[PDB]
């Protein structure tokens, strides 16, 4: 089977980790029956500097017309507004219909402290990220600003459905015989209904109603958790969570909190998922302090590729990637500076490849 | 000095830890020169079964210099007539700052931390201004208003600097601290909320200029997401943290998770002429009335309240007395892995 994959390295260590991932993809075992054709695409801060547009329209056109999926590196986002610049990643997610931001956090077997195997499913189109704000009073010393938080039944139902689909997929993997810390599947709905009774009420009702949309979701357990005690429980008993579904802001904050459970950010994967497309993306940024020195950790990117392949229906390939990656990490011989080692990007790519062909 | 203290034990273990704290206050050693008058007030879930009687408010305004609140057994769903009494108390008494010290005991298991989350407690999304703007079956759309004002944000900013200054003075009096330098970290998400969070940031930065003695305090700015990430890994990097309402709520609960038992974590709601101490733990229905609740969070919230009332001496010796018991490890409640009751640990602190 053929996958046409858009490659969008963008900036800094994006330009090192995406070629690493291409090498991984090109060299998957024959048993997977998976070939890739790649298309190189331009986006990011460097694209903005050269052309005045962070996301060329041609890049979006090729994605929609040629590609089955994409891999995005990292954008060197400015720290203030720049005229003519807008985030190409936020733009690509909107333009490609990628409404779900999926962030799995899974500890290594034999890791210290509480084990974790959870997935945060973050609604990624609305809430406060509609960016609709006004300075309603401009009195010197007494300004008043207001922002709109918007929650819709349609978007919330869609994200709830995606959570149940993910829960169902994880449960099938368990039932196929792969060990899991969870004995029962669970979707935990995150909210703050005691303050946001109308908006979070809608979010909650919509996610609960999503369970009714397919008879195969009926077996999945559902509960609800207030956001603040969710952070409390995340740090102390993260083993209690399977699939967690949240509106945009709570999901953003919880995903970043959960990333802390597994050590270096160069280990943390993500995918942006829509109904007809998926874009993998490592959680780390462009790391300009180390860009060009051949020491970037490509593990987050590898796991992001594997996550993408999970959503595309290549469970076997994904599982072998995860196993090969974890073996490198547990063995602890080949480690990049962010892992406390002295090894380079290419050394760790070679190590993953050596394991996958074992 | 004489303090008139409203006692609002409200629900569950609130009914046990508040009497424990009353006793402590009655037994404050002569050298602190501090006596209390106590007034018993009614509020909470039991009080509803109205959550907050008007009498309670009237008495706070006109008789009390401070107050101590236990815990409300909050329901899991909405109830006609019922609105949170602790939320209404804070607004009525003008308690704009929610203050949560998270401080590990020297030698305790767990990650060293010594920070205070200073949470703006009046606005942001908590203005509770929502509307179902589209009501079409299947296609509903709801909206809420997040409001950030320069005046509220400057005020919480100023409070954060006051607390940073007061903590630096404690260090310089000879109390050991994991911090060599005072720091205010301003929390925001201005890459998403450019206008509202931009105003919060500007206002807190400007609050530094309100007292010349703050110029010496280091200031930085951190995105709420990174801050949650950093709390788990390197909480020792933070001193005073100032945040708008929602980010403050999430961070205070993230920070609290660092301490082994919630029975050790205090808080105070602070306004310009009033303070109300309040333990962080809930009403703990499933140990209530068994005489084993941990009163330490309550003692430390009393201690916190005393600091804000200008009794650093009293507060120090409560912290020292409480710290001493905890470090001996002889008289500990079950949540600390011990076998002692509420009254026995109160006795133990009283002994110091
Ligand atoms: N792949 C990580 C990355 O590019 N980070 C920079 C950025 O601006 N990300 C957008 C976001 O936080 O959603
Ligand atoms: N003392 C903590 C407490 O009462 N928790 C229950 C609760 O819902 N309190 C509301 C709040 O403190 O914000």
- Enumerate the domain spans of chain B: 1-352
Paired tokens of B249: 């709520």
Cβ pair A153:B143 closer than 8 A: no
Which of A146, A154, A192 is nearest residue B145 as measured by Cβ atoms? Answer: A146
Contact between residue B118 and residue B160 where contact means Cβ atoms under 8 Å apart:
yes
Q: List CB contacts of B137: < 8 A, sequence separation 6 or more.
A: none
Contacts 24+ apart (CB under 8 A), B161-167: B161/B207, B161/B208, B161/B210, B161/B211, B161/B214, B161/B217, B163/B99, B163/B116, B163/B118, B163/B240, B164/B214, B164/B217, B164/B239, B164/B240, B165/B211, B165/B213, B165/B214, B165/B217, B166/B307, B166/B312, B167/B116, B167/B239, B167/B240
Structure method: X-ray
CB contact under 8 A, A231 and B253: yes
Q: Collect all residues with Cβ–Cβ distance below 8 Å to B320 and sequence separation of at least 6.
A: B352
Helix or strand holding residue B104 (H, E): none
Residues in CB range of A313: below 8 A, 6 or more apart: none
Integer Cα distance of A99 and B244 in angstroms: 28
Residue A152 contacts residue A126 (beta carbons within 8 Å): yes
For β-strands A35-40 and A2-10, DSSP reports them as: parallel
- Considering CB atoms only, which of B142, B198, B254 is closest to A257? B254
Angle between helices B14-26 and B296-308 (to 10 degrees): 50
Of B12, B74, B124, B246, the one to substitute when testing ligand 2's pocket (max ligand atoms within 8 A of C-beta) is: B74
Tracing tokens 């009073």 back to the chain, one arrives at A137
Q: Which ligand is nearest to the CA of A85?
A: 1
Q: How far is CA A28 from the centre of its chain?
A: 22
Task: Please tell us whether the domain made up of A1-358 is placed in CATH 3.40.718.10.
Answer: yes
Residue in A70, A75, A81 to alter for ligand 1 test, most ligand atoms within 8 A of Cβ:
A75
Structure tokens at B1: 């000095």
Residues B1-352, CATH architecture: 3-Layer(aba) Sandwich (3.40)
**Which distant-in-sequence residues (6+ apart) come within 8 Å of B39 by Cβ?**
B4, B5, B6, B7, B59, B63, B64
- Cα B274 to Cα B256: distance, rounded to the nearest angstrom: 24
Do the Cβ atoms of B346 and B291 come closer than 8 Å?
no
Torsion angle in degrees (nearest 10) through CA of A268, A273, A279, A283 = -20
* Residue A256 in contact with partner chain B when CB distance is under 8 A: yes
Q: How far apart are CA B130 and CA A203, in angstroms?
A: 14
Q: What are the distances in angstroms from CA B67 to CA A191, B249, B271, B306?
A: 31, 22, 12, 11
Q: Which ligand is nearest to the CA of A94?
A: 1
Which resolution in angstroms does this entry have? 1.9
Beta strands in A200-283 (DSSP E): 221-226, 243-246, 269-273, 278-282
Could you tell me which residues of B are annotated as the binding site for NADH? 72-74, 191, 282-286, 294
Please count the other Cβ atoms lying within 10 Å of the Cβ belonging to residue A153: 21
Overall residue count recorded for chain A in this entry: 358
Q: Which residue ranges of B are tagged as binding site? A: 72-74, 90, 100, 119, 126, 189, 191, 225, 249, 253, 282-286, 294
- Classified as helix, coil or strand, A8 is strand
Of chain A, the end-to-end C-alpha distance in Å amounts to 23
Answer for the pair A254, A246: CB distance below 8 angstroms, yes or no.
yes
Closest protein CA for atom 4 of ligand 2: B71
Taking the CA atoms of A233, A234, A240 and A246 in sequence, report the sign of the dihedral they define: positive
Ligand 1 centroid to residue A301 C-alpha, Å: 13
What is each CA distance from A305 to A18, A35, A271, B197, B206, in whole angstroms? Answer: 10, 14, 8, 35, 46
3-state class (DSSP) for residue A5: strand
Token look-up 């290549």 returns A314
A-chain residues within 8 Å CB-CB of B130?
Answer: 196-199
Residue-by-residue DSSP string for A62-114: HHHHH-SEEEEEE----SS--TT---HHHHHHHHTT--EEEEEEEPPTT-SSS
Cβ-defined contacts of A308-314 (< 8 Å, 24+): A308/A69, A308/A71, A308/A271, A308/A278, A308/A279, A308/A280, A309/A34, A310/A169, A311/A102, A311/A271, A311/A273, A311/A278, A312/A3, A312/A68, A312/A69, A312/A278, A314/A1, A314/A32, A314/A34
Beta bridge partners of A280: A71, A271
Question: How far is residue B60's CA from residue B42's CA, in Å, rounded to a whole number?
Answer: 11
Cα dihedral across residues B247, B251, B254, B257: positive or negative:
negative
Residue B27 structure tokens: 């037994």
Q: Which string of b and e fits B148-172 if b means at least 16 CB within 10 Å? A: bbbebbbbbbbbbbbbbbebbebee
Two tokens, residue A80: 């203030």
Enumerate the residues of chain A whose CB falls inside 8 A of the CB of residue B78: 197
Q: Is A87 in the pocket of ligand 1 (CB under 6 A)?
A: yes
DSSP secondary structure letters along B211-240:
SGGGTTSEEEEEEHHHHHHHHHH-GGG-SE
Pick A235's closest partner by Cβ from B225, B232, B246.
B232
Directed axis angle between helix B224-233 and helix A248-259, to 10°? Answer: 30
- Contact between residue B197 and residue B150 where contact means Cβ atoms under 8 Å apart: no
Please state the φ and ψ torsions of residue A36, each to the nearest 5 degrees.
-120, 140
In Å, the largest CA–CA distance within chain B is 69
3-state class (DSSP) for residue B20: helix
Q: Any alpha helices (H) in B44-102, and if so which ranges?
A: 45-48, 54-63, 85-92
- The span from the first CA to the last CA of chain B, in angstroms, equals 21
User: B145 has which bridge partners?
Assistant: A148
On whether the CB atoms of residues B193 and A132 are closer than 8 A, the answer is no
> Which A positions 135-174 lie with beta carbon below 8 A of chain B?
135, 141-154
Q: How many CB atoms lie within 10 A of CB A253?
A: 28
**DSSP string for residues in B307-348:** HHTT-HHHHHHHHHHHHHHHHHTSS--GGGT----HHHHHHH
């Amino acid at each position: 089977r053929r996958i046409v994959l858009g490659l969008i390295p963008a900036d800094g260590i994006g330009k090192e980790v995406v070629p690493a991932a291409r090498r991984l993809m090109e060299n998957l075992p024959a048993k997977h029956k998976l070939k890739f054709d790649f298309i190189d695409l331009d986006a990011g801060w460097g694209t903005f500097e050269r052309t005045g547009k962070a996301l060329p329209e041609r890049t979006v056109e090729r994605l929609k017309t040629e590609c089955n999926a994409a891999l995005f590196g990292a954008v060197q986002s400015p720290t203030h507004k720049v005229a003519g610049y807008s985030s190409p990643i936020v733009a690509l997610r909107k333009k490609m219909g990628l409404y779900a931001n999926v962030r799995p956090v899974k500890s290594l077997d034999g890791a210290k402290g509480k084990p974790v195997d959870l997935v945060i499913v973050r609604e990624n189109t609305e809430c406060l990220y509609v960016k609709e704000e006004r300075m309603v009073q401009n009195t010197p010393g007494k300004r008043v600003a207001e922002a709109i938080r918007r929650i819709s039944e349609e978007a919330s139902t869609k994200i709830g459905k995606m959570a149940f689909e993910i829960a169902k997929s994880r449960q099938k993997i368990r039932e196929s015989g792969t060990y899991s810390i969870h004995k029962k599947p669970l979707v935990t709905i995150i909210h703050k209904s005691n303050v946001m009774s109308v908006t979070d009420g809608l979010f909650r009702e919509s996610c609960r109603h999503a369970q009714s949309l397919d008879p195969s979701y009926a077996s999945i357990n559902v509960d609800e958790q207030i956001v603040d005690s969710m952070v409390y429980r995340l740090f102390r008993e993260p083993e209690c969570f399977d699939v967690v579904v949240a509106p945009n802001l709570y999901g953003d904050i919880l995903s970043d909190g959960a990333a802390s459970l597994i050590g270096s950010l160069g280990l943390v994967p993500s995918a942006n998922v829509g109904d007809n497309f998926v874009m993998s993306e490592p959680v780390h940024g462009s790391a300009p302090d180390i860009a060009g020195r051949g020491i970037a950790n490509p593990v987050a990117t590898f796991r992001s590729v594997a996550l993408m392949l999970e959503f595309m229906g290549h469970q076997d390939a994904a599982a072998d990637i995860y196993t090969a990656v974890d073996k490198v990490l547990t063995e602890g011989k080949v480690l990049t500076p962010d892992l406390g080692g002295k090894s380079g990007t290419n050394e760790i790519t070679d190590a993953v490849l050596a394991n996958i062909h074992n």
